[model samples]
Target chain A: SALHVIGTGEVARFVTSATGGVVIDSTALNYNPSLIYRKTNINRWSMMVNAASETGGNAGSNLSILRYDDTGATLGAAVTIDRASGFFGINTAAPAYNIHVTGTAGLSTGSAWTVA
Target chain B: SALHVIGTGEVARFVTSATGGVVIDSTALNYNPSLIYRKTNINRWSMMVNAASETGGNAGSNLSILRYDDTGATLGAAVTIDRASGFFGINTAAPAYNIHVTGTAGLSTGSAWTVA
Candidate 1:
């Protein structure tokens, strides 16, 4: 476990560099801030940040991987690319690929970065 | 130069409007999150929120603008109406049009709103 202060302004860092600090927004009461709690919470939604590197990419190149998992961590989405390598049921903790929305959302060179 | 606190819940804000606030994520583990750095980082990406006022707009009017820039803030994308006038060279630091994803992302109009 990492060691550090915990609370508002408490920086939750994953690296020694200045690029990975989580900026917590606890103010602005009406800005509609939320998080998932009850496993049944249908308001389930998420966003991700990625630093993709590609040996090759196309217009449909991978941008961000979006997946929806049921609360309780049960009934997860795509767990494998071909769904055969790992018999991990759709819930297997294995990595997988589902849909790809590529248009250079957060990619460099405005070019599709290819992935192996 | 707005002065304020620099900590968790530390809200980096702009505009006194009712919206425009960045929500920081710091609670989940195993989920990937990231930000881009370095002109060569190639992890560059960005997002923005907008409230539109339109005299006229079609399926594609004016929504949000997205552009990729080198980490050095060198080359910018889309710097003119037809590429002239400001001839910003896509990097003169003047606002220009680029990509617009229209839908109900954060828009308050469950109903269609038009723009000029």
Candidate 2:
């Protein structure tokens, strides 16, 4: 019979191979300027200095990447990219973050650079 | 005292340096379709195959460079770059030309490109 450990403490111990689970303090991890919340919510997150707009934001939000402030200290919010305005924004709420925007425009021709 | 001579005929003869002035017929110089006119009138001008829009127009016109057609055979009027539309314009006039435009735009993430 296979031995299966069940319980938060047992599972944590098993997952860490009995070497004691890594105790990452939320306060220490939250020190980052920007963070990415892929699963939606304040917990279960990935912290970063600058989150990419194309990768940040709620699913289907069409937001750009957070190329600026990642740490939510200056603005008690997450930085977010604004695709419509082509700039970055700060989300000052539970799901906070920063985003930056950029691109090309105008009439072009000949053997010139293109957005392909 | 130096011997001096005055008269259109005498001046023309002396200016030729006695080697006889090269007579270039109008037909030979009129072959180029696209031309530049620093002066307002078309009779006196400079001919080019692809005239740059920024340099080929009448004074006070905000046009871009014609990077495409200078040889008027393709277009009747001089080709011109449209700064507003960000595109080239084919002029179908006696003094024809062609123009091309280019530039950049959009959202930023990290080390990205920009139009300065």
What's the number of clashes in each of the models? Answer: 10, 55
What fraction of the genuine interface contacts, i.e. the true contacts, does candidate 2 reproduce?
A: 0.04
| lDDT values for all models | 0.25, 0.25
Per-residue lDDT tens digits for candidate 1, residues A1-116, read 12222334322323312213332222322221212222233323332222232222211111122355554342433221111111111222332322212111242334332221
Q: Write the per-residue lDDT of candidate 2 for residues A18-43, one digit (tens) a residue.
A: 23212212233223232222111111
Q: Model 1: how far is A43 from its true place, Å?
A: 9.3
TM-score of each: 0.26, 0.15
Cα RMSD to native, each candidate? 16.8, 34.0
TM-score of chain B of each: 0.21, 0.19
- Cα lDDT for residue B26, candidate 2: 15
Give a tens-digit lDDT track for model 2, residues B40-65. 11122322222223232221122212
**Best-fitting candidate, measured by DockQ?**
1
